Amino acid sequence: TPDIKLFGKWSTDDVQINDISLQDYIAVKEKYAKYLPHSAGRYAAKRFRKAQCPIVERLTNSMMMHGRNNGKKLMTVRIVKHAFEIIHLLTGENPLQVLVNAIINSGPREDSTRIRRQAVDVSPLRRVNQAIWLLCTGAREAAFRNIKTIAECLADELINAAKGSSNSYAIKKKDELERVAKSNR
């Protein structure tokens, strides 16, 4: 079908990015629709070439963490695949929409820095990378030494972060960085 692309079975359409600041750094729609979140790569060649990578791929890459899982993309593509029907069978919403809402609500706006620390706002791209960061290490902390598999702990956090349930590892870390930044400012 040269007309529509479904992420395996997930339609790339009707996904609104409310926050205007990030709809330039979230490759999700209308040219970045892929069936697999596994691509050849090369997105880390030049500086800002990382922006035109589909986020589901960027979510897939940031899952291969902590040693033993390094270089096991075929396992994480199975993980994010399985996580997508789990959220669909736990929310009823579109998986792509839930993932977008999560990285928006988990990217910190301010961050302090050593210039005595001065609080400065972050760039959109750094905000997206930090967003994918928080909700990946969060699920890694949940699945570790726990009967709950890596798929579900990934599923609920981006469910809880989409609404900012304040029990997500991402949200608890996001406002904390925005609270420290609100202090030394």
Binding site: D19, I20, V120, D121, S123, L125
Partner: protein, 62 residues
């Protein structure tokens, strides 16, 4: 206090002790006339927009 949206107009230079922050001449999408200078973290292109948690902070020019 309301948050505001700011559209970058030109990147000025790198700053910070480790050269980690970037100074940018950023302009408010709400009204282009009022324009500010502001230090930012992370990589920044030209033409991307920010979310200032307060507008009244002007970053000292290096």
């Amino acid at each position: 206090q309301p948050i505001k949206l700011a559209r970058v107009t030109k990147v000025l230079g790198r700053t910070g002790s480790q050269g980690q922050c970037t100074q940018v001449r950023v302009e408010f999408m709400d009204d282009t006339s009022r324009s500010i200078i502001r230090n930012v973290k992370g990589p920044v292109r030209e033409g991307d927009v920010l979310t200032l948690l307060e507008s009244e902070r002007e970053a000292r020019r290096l």
